[PDB]
Amino acid sequence: MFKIVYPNAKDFFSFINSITNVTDSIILNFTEDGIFSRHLTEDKVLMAIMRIPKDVLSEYSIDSPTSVKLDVSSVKKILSKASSKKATIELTETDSGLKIIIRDEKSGAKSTIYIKAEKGQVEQLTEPKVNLAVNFTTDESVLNVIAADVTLVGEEMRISTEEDKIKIEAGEEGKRYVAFLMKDKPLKELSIDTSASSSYSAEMFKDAVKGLRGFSAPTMVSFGENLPMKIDVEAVSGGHMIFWIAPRL
Amino acid sequence: MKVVYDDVRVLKDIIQALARLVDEAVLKFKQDSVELVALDRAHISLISVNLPREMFKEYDVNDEFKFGFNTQYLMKILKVAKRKEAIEIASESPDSVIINIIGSTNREFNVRNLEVSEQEIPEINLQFDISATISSDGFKSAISEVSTVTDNVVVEGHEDRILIKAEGESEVEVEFSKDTGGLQDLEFSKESKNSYSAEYLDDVLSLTKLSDYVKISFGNQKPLQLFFNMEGGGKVTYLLAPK
Amino acid sequence: MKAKVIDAVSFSYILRTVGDFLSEANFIVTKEGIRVSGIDPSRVVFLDIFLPSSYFEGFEVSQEKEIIGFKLEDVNDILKRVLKDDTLILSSNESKLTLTFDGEFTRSFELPLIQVESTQPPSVNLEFPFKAQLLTITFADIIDELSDLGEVLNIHSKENKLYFEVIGDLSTAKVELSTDNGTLLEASGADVSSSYGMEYVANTTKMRRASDSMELYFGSQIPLKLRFKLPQEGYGDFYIAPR
């Protein structure tokens, strides 16, 4: 019977774009609790997870928890050409795979996309079980500034706590970069349980922050001493886009 | 002879479609109209333009004047304007066209007139199995969407709906229906289905900025015709041959 | 030295301009301000930028004269990281120049100093037959519009009217600048004519972002001097050689 209706097509693909950043192949999981998809880089350091609880979907039907593996290259291409604002999105099961259908209000244009898909059994959603002392919440825009001037100076970002401040430095002895973030300059919220410092790939931070485009809502960052970084945003129309970034040395 | 049109952008939009279809063209300035007719490089598609004198702020044309031009070049000069700005075209002799683009600054172009070999295109009068009216934006979105996966755009015609679709390894179908409110007007006389070059349809997409709706007409073993009905009375018609 | 430029963005465009001409330069810091001067590799453009003490707030020197060498690419690379409403505190020591942005949050970039050839400066002191004062906006608009149409900019005057032209075998572009035209703030001098590399005059356009008013000088077979009036009697002078 399987049916998914999400209130906003653009927001839905902000998810899809983020997990299909390096490969166009994707495994979506339909379960009792809703929809979730996951991707890890081949070097294991950047994991991207999308999660959409069912209460957020307008229409949801599944016979049994199932997975779908599909190549989404094409679909991605054509929807970027769907000049659309508020359009809703449907994915209904097809005898052969999927059936994405979008409707534009101003034009009346029902574009239905037929893609082939191999059904399967559910992956298991799991969440690094780890305690992250430092939490700050800010803006995709702020993060994008940081990524871009971090990558200009080096290959690795080093984030640390000081006194009510988050410190971000990158680079080598010649050309260093150093940023200090704090409450209302520009952080929306800040909590530091215990002092902590860690180091991450700039390239990987660049990419996780790239998946935050199309997510305008507050963004939450968390980490700890030689622990991973968690970045997580809730889509306006509902559903969490989350990133996990492995630490170094 | 001298004309003044109050918004060069409008003219930009037509010439852009033209420039993608052809290297050189001629705007015929006539007594009660400015006309342009051009078969594309490869002689598959015909574009026809008619700009009634009622559209122009100033209009002084006594006798037919042929303004032959490098389409791509005329493109450049029309692009100079970014806000709404008037275009002034004049001529004193057969050899020279003087174009003025008026904004906060007045940009004059003294262009040497091109003599472009123009062939007699035989005249149409084709009956269409189907002609339907949908939104230009919609038609742009539609073609843009489909072209992304195919260079053969299938156009399908039915008693209640028109589909713009792809049928290759990807399947995409963009529907405009009566009940959807997408299909504004439907002149039906037979089921139709035919394919059309996507790149020719892409050349032409600038034309959608000319009107809120595009009248689209076609039929089995017949050419696709886009008709753009402009305010003021202007007319741009695009005639594409099939596969 | 330690200096604070509040309009960090506008500042940035001054340097982005300079980078088009020089690949390396020195800030020469004295009690009266920062000066940047150099000649392009082809020896057609000679630039001279002066940023007075007053241009910055909290201008502080450490010694009589301080020479700070830098690659333009690198300084511009970090300067590309400016945010709309943020200020620049730029300060130096023996080893490294550091740039600090201050807006939504504090950000600083460190850049090692490098040794730049300084000791042999070109001197330009010339009297010009024609001088005009003009809005820099109006200037850059037309140059951007023109830069596409040719490799040579032709300029001349008649009866205190100023003409920018682009001559081609197939067309010619023409712009009349004048007092009554409203485009010129002032204009006087002889009827002289000249031509200049279009590429070089174009790079100049950016100063739009750093200056509101501007001075134009030229004459038959002598340099075009472009003076960009900056905040607080600052100037960005560009001397571009004739053809």
From Swiss-Prot, chain A:
Function per UniProt: One of the sliding clamp subunits that acts as a moving platform for DNA processing. Responsible for tethering the catalytic subunit of DNA polymerase to DNA during high-speed replication. Heterotrimer stimulates the Holliday junction resolvase Hjc. DNA polymerase I, DNA ligase and the flap endonuclease may be constitutively associated with the PCNA heterotrimer forming a scanning complex able to couple DNA synthesis and Okazaki fragment maturation.
HAMAP family xrefs: DNApol_clamp_arch (MF_00317)
Similarity comment: family membership: Belongs to the PCNA family.
Gene that encodes it: pcn1
Protein name, UniProt field: DNA polymerase sliding clamp 1
Gene3D superfamilies reported for this sequence: 3.70.10.10
Oligomer status and interactors: Forms heterodimers with PCNA2, which then recruit PCNA3; does not form homotrimers. The heterodimers interact with RfcS homotetramers. Heterotrimer which circularizes head-to-tail (head is at N-terminus, tail is at C-terminus) to form a toroid; DNA passes through its center. Replication factor C (RFC) is required to load the toroid on the DNA. Heterotrimer interacts, probably via this subunit, with flap endonuclease 1 (fen), Hjc, Dpo4, and XPF.
InterPro entries: DNA_clamp_sf, Pr_cel_nuc_antig, Pr_cel_nuc_antig_N
Keywords: DNA replication, DNA-binding
Single GO molecular function: DNA polymerase processivity factor activity
GO BP terms: leading strand elongation; regulation of DNA replication
UniProtKB/Swiss-Prot annotation, chain B:
Keyword terms: DNA replication, DNA-binding
PROSITE patterns reported in the protein's UniProt record: PCNA_1 (PS01251)
Any one Gene Ontology molecular-function term assigned to this protein's record: DNA polymerase processivity factor activity
BP-aspect Gene Ontology terms: leading strand elongation; regulation of DNA replication
Tree of life domain: Archaea
HAMAP family: DNApol_clamp_arch
Complex formation: Does not individually interact with either of the other PCNA subunits, but is recruited to a PCNA1-PCNA2 heterodimer; does not form homotrimers. Heterotrimer which circularizes head-to-tail (head is at N-terminus, tail is at C-terminus) to form a toroid; DNA passes through its center. Replication factor C (RFC) is required to load the toroid on the DNA. This subunit interacts with DNA ligase, RfcL, XPF, and weakly with DNA polymerase I.
Physiological role: One of the sliding clamp subunits that acts as a moving platform for DNA processing. Responsible for tethering the catalytic subunit of DNA polymerase to DNA during high-speed replication. DNA polymerase I, DNA ligase and the flap endonuclease may be constitutively associated with the PCNA heterotrimer forming a scanning complex able to couple DNA synthesis and Okazaki fragment maturation. Heterotrimer stimulates the Holliday junction resolvase Hjc.
Name of the protein in question: DNA polymerase sliding clamp 3
Protein source organism: Saccharolobus solfataricus (strain ATCC 35092 / DSM 1617 / JCM 11322 / P2) (Sulfolobus solfataricus)
Lineage: Archaea, Thermoproteota, Thermoprotei, Sulfolobales, Sulfolobaceae
Swiss-Prot record, chain C:
DNA-binding in keyword set: yes
Protein family membership: Belongs to the PCNA family.
Function, in words: One of the sliding clamp subunits that acts as a moving platform for DNA processing. Responsible for tethering the catalytic subunit of DNA polymerase to DNA during high-speed replication. Heterotrimer stimulates the Holliday junction resolvase Hjc. DNA polymerase I, DNA ligase and the flap endonuclease may be constitutively associated with the PCNA heterotrimer forming a scanning complex able to couple DNA synthesis and Okazaki fragment maturation.
Presence of keyword DNA-binding: yes
GO biological process, any: leading strand elongation
UniProt source species: Saccharolobus solfataricus (strain ATCC 35092 / DSM 1617 / JCM 11322 / P2)
Gene (UniProt): pcn2
CDD domains: PCNA (cd00577)
Protein name: DNA polymerase sliding clamp 2
Tree of life domain: Archaea
Listed PROSITE patterns: PCNA_1
Gene3D superfamilies with a match to the protein in the record: 3.70.10.10
Subunit structure: Forms homodimers with PCNA1, which then recruit PCNA3; does not form homotrimers. The heterodimers interact with RfcS homotetramers. Heterotrimer which circularizes head-to-tail (head is at N-terminus, tail is at C-terminus) to form a toroid; DNA passes through its center. Replication factor C (RFC) is required to load the toroid on the DNA. This subunit interacts with DNA polymerase I (dpo1). The heterotrimer also interacts with flap endonuclease 1, DNA ligase and XPF via the other subunits.
Keywords: DNA replication, DNA-binding
